[PDB]
Amino acid sequence: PIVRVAVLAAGDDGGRLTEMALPSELPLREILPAVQRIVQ
Amino acid sequence: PIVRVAVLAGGRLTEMALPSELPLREILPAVQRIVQVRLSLAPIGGAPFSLDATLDTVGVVDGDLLALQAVPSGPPAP
Amino acid sequence: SRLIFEHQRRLTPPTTRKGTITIEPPPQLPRVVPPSLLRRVLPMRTEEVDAERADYLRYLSVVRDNVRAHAAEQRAALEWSHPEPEVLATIPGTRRQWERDPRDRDFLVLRAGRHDVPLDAALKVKDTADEIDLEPVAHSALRGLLDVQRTVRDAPTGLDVAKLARITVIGEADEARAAIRAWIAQAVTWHDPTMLGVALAAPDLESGDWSWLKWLPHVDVPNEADGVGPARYLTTSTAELRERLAPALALKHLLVVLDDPDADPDDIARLTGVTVIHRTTELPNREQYPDPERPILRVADGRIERWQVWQPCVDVADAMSAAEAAHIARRLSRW
């Protein structure tokens, strides 16, 4: 039951926007490593 | 030789240990009988791995998040 | 299986100029002569003494600013070295994980919350009077200063374990295991898994409870695989944990925790630093003024109230959750 969302992060010079699909019904406490690894 | 990874089902992530250099055609029933059309393993929001790839070459190490979802129609979605 | 870490140098947050700030005593109530209308009806009197008052108050303002700068340094350091029990999820990656060494002032110190740290700097005045009377409006200001600018406001406390040898908490079940998991993770995260060791004994270990020590290589053994777990001292029997540590018992520091209130508390010790932790059911009432070592701790809603004769000793406690510690262990098992 995955969902397809877009994420934004602007800390270095402007920001970066890129979509993804992350599994639902789970605590974000574990996805944050992945999404941090991606856009950074 | 063995890696203990956080494996996802539909949550209730499990704590399982897996070999390092084995095809996945055999872990798929192993995981379907441990925690639980074909599924595959991947990092969360990462392209599914080749079902005959090896867990040590694609870079999976202790502490990772390996999911169970169906197989795509070919493109990796860069 | 696991990656490799290299002993990159620890970074230095600006430490304290732990000196002796000194303050000049106020003036000495200069005697004022009567106004005398005769020589006061023409159109050393109050004007001069007021000038002197104003001068001293200015000097006081300067000193207050300086001591506030010192307090800023102190709180900066203490926040740097004991971050809040959420940032520690991000620490196992970067080069600051094993940044604690046995030569450093913060060693084997375990954060537990925030309360008033007494500003280690000196603040000594050189009073040399035999009860001479000092000016009222200056002495009032200095006295009102030396009491509120002497204790830092809420700052990251320290539950050091280098000189305790026994910890015994008291109170509700999971409120305890919270602070326990909290500082136990805060401990293992900063110090080399080759330098300190931890031990566990609990009945329902693998239920989202103390299970989370699975991926822990601080609980490891030298030269043993145990199949999947590093050492998996994580057990349920007490003397069994002793025997699993009987060779390891002998300096790699040891941290033995026990989720069981019963099952022969105080059965390994009473050594030379090896610390025991044991959650208790109920308290002593007339303890012989408990030693600062092996003390008594009660867990309130947000207090960790020490046992002394109630001296809350923490006003906002640092509490962790189970799943958080789980994700901590998971992340840290990588390097």
From Swiss-Prot, chain A:
Subcellular location per the Swiss-Prot or TrEMBL entry: Cell inner membrane
Residue pairs linked by disulfide bridges in the UniProt entry: none
KO phenotype (gene knockout): Deletion of the gene impairs iron-bound mycobactin utilization and EsxG and EsxH export.
Domain of life: Bacteria
Quaternary structure, from the entry: Part of the ESX-3 / type VII secretion system (T7SS), which is composed of cytosolic and membrane components. The ESX-3 membrane complex is composed of EccB3, EccC3, EccD3 and EccE3.
Role, per record: Part of the ESX-3 specialized secretion system, which is required for siderophore-mediated iron acquisition and for the secretion of EsxH and EsxG.
Family (UniProt): Belongs to the EccD/Snm4 family.
Protein name: ESX-3 secretion system protein EccD3
Gene from which this protein is expressed: eccD3
Swiss-Prot record, chain B:
Gene disruption: observed consequences: Deletion of the gene impairs iron-bound mycobactin utilization and EsxG and EsxH export.
Location in the cell: Cell inner membrane
Family: Belongs to the EccD/Snm4 family.
Assembly notes: Part of the ESX-3 / type VII secretion system (T7SS), which is composed of cytosolic and membrane components. The ESX-3 membrane complex is composed of EccB3, EccC3, EccD3 and EccE3.
Primary role: Part of the ESX-3 specialized secretion system, which is required for siderophore-mediated iron acquisition and for the secretion of EsxH and EsxG.
Protein name: ESX-3 secretion system protein EccD3
Source taxonomy: Bacteria, Bacillati, Actinomycetota, Actinomycetes, Mycobacteriales
Residues of the full protein shown: 8 to 106 of 475
Swiss-Prot record, chain C:
Cellular localisation: Cell inner membrane
Gene Ontology terms, MF aspect: ATP binding; ATP hydrolysis activity; DNA binding
Effect of inactivating the gene: Deletion of the gene impairs iron-bound mycobactin utilization and EsxG and EsxH export.
Keyword vocabulary terms for this entry: ATP-binding, Cell inner membrane, Cell membrane, Membrane, Nucleotide-binding, Repeat, Transmembrane, Transmembrane helix, Transport
Keyword Nuclease set for record: no
Quaternary structure annotation from Swiss-Prot or TrEMBL: Part of the ESX-3 / type VII secretion system (T7SS), which is composed of cytosolic and membrane components. The ESX-3 membrane complex is composed of EccB3, EccC3, EccD3 and EccE3.
Known role: Part of the ESX-3 specialized secretion system, which is required for siderophore-mediated iron acquisition and for the secretion of EsxH and EsxG.
Descriptive protein name: ESX-3 secretion system protein EccC3
Species per Swiss-Prot/TrEMBL record: Mycolicibacterium smegmatis (strain ATCC 700084 / mc(2)155)
